[PDB]
């Protein structure tokens, strides 16, 4: 029985890679028509998947960059129990494998990282493990701070307790309306069968917290250049973390753009925001490439 995606598609019929844990990961690529000037890995957030970055990737591809990605373990078309991971570092390790693989085929090319939410945390931790290895990082409402509301020192304590007693315990529920102010995208979001909307599991929320702790420790050694995109009304990733990221990161090349009133999914928000986001990412990456 050939290995198949959680949606029953055989892996031999799709682009993929096998991780250190022997798990198949669904891969995605956007190769420019000619010799690429640089490489860029896209890191998606929790529950979502790599296919959600189709248009963003097509814009980057139009700049002559070889865009690539894969669905994190337990996500999209990749193997593994939905939204669960032995340890958060697995996400980083897998990213490095994919990056290391792509760099071998395209030697001497600069490598950028693009991450959103949990994807942002992964990106930060990826560069933090390889100082001076990446050319730049594009962060869209990255996970850097614990929800001052959804995760207080008390709720974290309780979650840790649940982890010992009811680890497999699934939580919830999160209103998809806090993702974007664009109703179309909210519907689109609820219609995606590759997305996961089954509420954060206990053991996974712990990992998410591990991620934030790790990111905070990493910041004093983060030197990679970055573009930080954040919305003021982000109820998932508080803008407080964005300002803290700008302050605590040691990077010499760091930019912050705030979108007043915007929500979480900046790249899938109101046309006026999405347009600026796409544009800003374009200008930023363009200047850092040649």
């Amino acid at each position: 029985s050939p290995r198949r995606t959680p949606q029953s598609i055989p892996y031999q019929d799709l682009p993929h890679l096998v991780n250190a844990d022997g798990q198949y990961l669904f891969c995605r690529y956007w190769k420019p028509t000619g010799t690429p000037k640089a490489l860029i890995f896209v890191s998606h957030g929790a529950g979502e998947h790599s296919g959600r970055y189709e248009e963003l990737a097509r814009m980057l591809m139009g700049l002559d960059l070889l865009v690539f990605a894969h669905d994190h373990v337990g996500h999209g078309q990749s193997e593994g129990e939905r939204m669960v991971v032995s340890d958060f570092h697995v996400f980083v390790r897998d990213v490095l494998q994919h990056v290391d693989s792509m760099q071998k085929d395209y030697p001497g090319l600069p490598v950028f990282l693009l991450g959103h939410s949990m994807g942002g945390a992964i990106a930060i931790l990826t560069a933090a493990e390889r100082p001076g290895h990446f050319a730049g990082m594009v962060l869209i409402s990255p996970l850097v701070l614990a929800n001052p509301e959804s995760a207080t020192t008390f709720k974290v304590l309780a979650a840790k307790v649940l982890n010992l007693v009811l680890p497999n315990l699934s939580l919830g529920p999160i209103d998809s309306s806090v993702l974007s102010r664009n109703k179309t995208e909210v519907d689109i979001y609820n219609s995606d069968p590759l997305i996961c909307r089954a509420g954060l599991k206990v053991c996974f929320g712990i990992q998410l917290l591990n991620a934030v702790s790790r990111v905070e420790r990493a910041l004093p050694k983060l030197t990679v250049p970055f573009l930080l995109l954040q919305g003021s009304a982000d109820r998932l990733c508080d803008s407080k973390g964005a300002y803290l990221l700008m302050e605590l990161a040691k990077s010499q090349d760091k930019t912050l753009k705030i979108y007043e009133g915007a929500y979480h999914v900046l790249h899938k928000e109101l046309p006026e925001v999405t347009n600026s986001v796409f544009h800003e990412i374009n200008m930023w990456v363009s200047q850092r490439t040649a």
Copy 2:
């Protein structure tokens, strides 16, 4: 500001009633063309709503029965925080008010109860509080026993603990595929904006457990006639409870029909099951009416 449904429709524009807690409840009616031979209240399950019984109600209406219902508090178009109730008895109290109201307009008419899942528990508790008052009860995979898997003496203990620390804590996630084997209805189920699919809250799961405890105590005094419809593969309401209901209830008029392999939502299952269900309910109620 006139009171409006959770979906923003003013209550003065829909049939409704105001409960003892001063909360508006959305009402639904199916009045036969001529003098009704009997009355029948429909009690929906958790998360769902009264509109889901359109066809079942139309069949009953065709038998000359005045069908009526309302969305339980915190459900459908009724007021109240989604899937929460101060105490389970509130559901019963409200049913009695609606029944008491309808009986006043149609004196001397017999009154039946139709309940599914949590709705079944409510029905049982309603008749148990008014012995010899109802003519009959139709139960579709009623809530009578605690999930031997989802709620063991340990998980119940943990839930009770969570109730003290994280009461407002929402849970999850429940796969909608365990509801029916009919894919159309599963999609239909996920498309209903009146239905609630945000995972069982902690404080509410407690109430659900209160319900089961109360039902067990009530059974030794339950004398109302009933038709019990249950599926063998029900992962929400184990068939064990059905057999126990047949054995522990004191009723002199009690019937049990098992649907081999069928799931939870019997009235929305495979055509062959739904057809028999509708038919059996028809024959059963018909014989008890004149």
Copy 3:
């Protein structure tokens, strides 16, 4: 088999009374040689017992007051599981029974209350239930406030959790050196076989907390006259509660005496403190009696 004390002495051989719960309570009396001018019930603290007030009682007896007492349920020579009570109010109820019994034999006589620690809480709650019934109250480092250290909003939450899971769970350990600065009495305290030094049980700590809550609510209606004796270095009953008691109680006749550096057991502290305590209690009660 005639009922015997927890130490195996038959109750028919000692002064006693039987409470509403059918439990035997060991009684103690100090009757003046002639007609008593007033009655005074002594309420001991947790773990300890009525025999610990021998000398204090003998001084009061020398003032022509009929002193009386009994070991609270689950204490000293009284029946009941060590340091456990269905509800704190039981302590109050039993006090009233004993007071009501003694008043019948000595009609028209004024009635005072003397309480220490938990005994103080009981005294306050006793008078609060019978406004204008008692002539006065003598409070020695009374239980009125929750240990700002041993019981924070978090520890209380945890205790409540333990009450559901591990109610019978016994705690600990409390250093007897925090009771008094007088080493002799500390040794004396550890040598008493009637005293309980087995650490506070979970279910009992809850009751203790109930007591504090009840006392706080009662204070706005407490009108009984009182003498408040408190030590600055009391690590069991923080002096903060004493000042709060002086402020929150409505009594028109309220006095506070602070013993600088003194510990918990004021009546069993350094000679200089104990001497003043005995003296102050003497003067205070004397003026209120005739």
Copy 4:
């Protein structure tokens, strides 16, 4: 300020050693008058101390064995917070240091281990780490199995929970009457100011559980000869563990003696038991020495 024992005696005035954690441990020695035929380390149980083995040690000394010991960290006259240890292995590590020190001064001499309760677990783990290094082991009601009553899979789970929330949380209370049937020794036990009777702390109970887990894993590789002394009525260390120890240990030289009705502290039990214990230990060790 020279380091002093918890009882204020300077360490320079007593025999001692400094552990790997820089903590002072109170040492005790019983050196025969002439060249010793072997060495024997005594491992005391929880709360107690090395001085409790005075007579046992004097008997062993009379057999020409160099007896030695030290109070485990957080015990007796040794430094460290009462009844707490970073990890159970610390106890083993310290034993090896003391053994390694003594062996250097007395090269080529065989080395025996004597342990009671928690002391027995330490002894087993000490030999398990150094297979074929010790000549023999004398075990008195050793800690090998979790209290089927005081520690069920549920209570262990709860304890682990407490470890995360209330680690410093002290427990209780343990009736000293379950130690021995000899009332004199029970009094003696309660009179010892070097003994600890402040109830088992949460973080420490965890370690105790770690110990049992470790012992069970070690048994399949335990080859050291041993004498196992156990009482049938031991409520602290169930005799079940003794039989399991006899069965699960791989040792070729293993003996078991059961004392019918006897309690925990076999060496401090009824004269008839203590006499046999001392005698049996004498015969057993004598045969294994020359």
